[PDB]
Amino acid sequence: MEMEKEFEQIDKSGSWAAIYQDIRHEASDFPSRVAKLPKNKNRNRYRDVSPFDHSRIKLHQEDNDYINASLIKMEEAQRSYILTQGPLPNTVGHFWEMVWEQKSRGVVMLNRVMEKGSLKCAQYWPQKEEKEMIFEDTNLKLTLISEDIKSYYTVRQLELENLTTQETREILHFHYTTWPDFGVPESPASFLNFLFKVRESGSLSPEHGPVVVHCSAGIGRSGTFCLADTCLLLMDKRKDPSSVDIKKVLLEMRKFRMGLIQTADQLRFSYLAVIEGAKFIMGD
């Protein structure tokens, strides 16, 4: 069924809350035993958001290999994503270790450091060229190279140095700066514009390790970004737009990380973004 007609049918019947609960009911349930170990309690922002053991990203150290991060591997689309929580004051060094070890080119940030008057994640990148950050626990240095501030988003160029080997890489930071908590990113236009800027950077391409994507918990807004990207890619790979079931792609993604898409409004917005973005994919 053409999703654009499924859309209008759900809208006219007002059954978004009912579709959403059907997804919640059919969603995979896998163990998260490492996340729940007592040594890892201060590595988790939220008690009810954990990575599954089978898909969790492992840090390359014997001490404690744990970070609240998941590898989402989409086989047919040939895309991978790392979805993670907003880093904590004590996990900022683990976050940049993961970026280094996984060979990511891009970090996509979909939240503000403060929302609704509370801190949603640590200030994990330098705000001034001349004030670089050193992460002593993981032996990394991070420097702001340049910053490009637009109306809906900011792009930053960062330099990541492994202080152990003196190897250096440029990492791109894509910061979507106007998405409300459990809210919807305005209208498909600014969201899709931001997605196409990440794609044009090379950050999502197979010559690079997986993009790192986060919001506060790494499931809501983060889920919307990778669902919309993957559904548009599947329309392209076969150029048969009808052969895309958004609910089935979401359930496939939920085998790798729990809770992706947090509200029935986020589900509806994901549909809008895919339907409007297809009007480019199909040759316009």
Ligand SMILES: CC(=O)c1ccccc1Sc1ccccc1C(=O)O
């Ligand atoms: C070592 C390496 O090549 C690399 C691996 C992963 C992420 C970033 C990088 S660095 C990079 C990637 C693309 C374009 C320019 C640069 C740059 O170094 O300016």
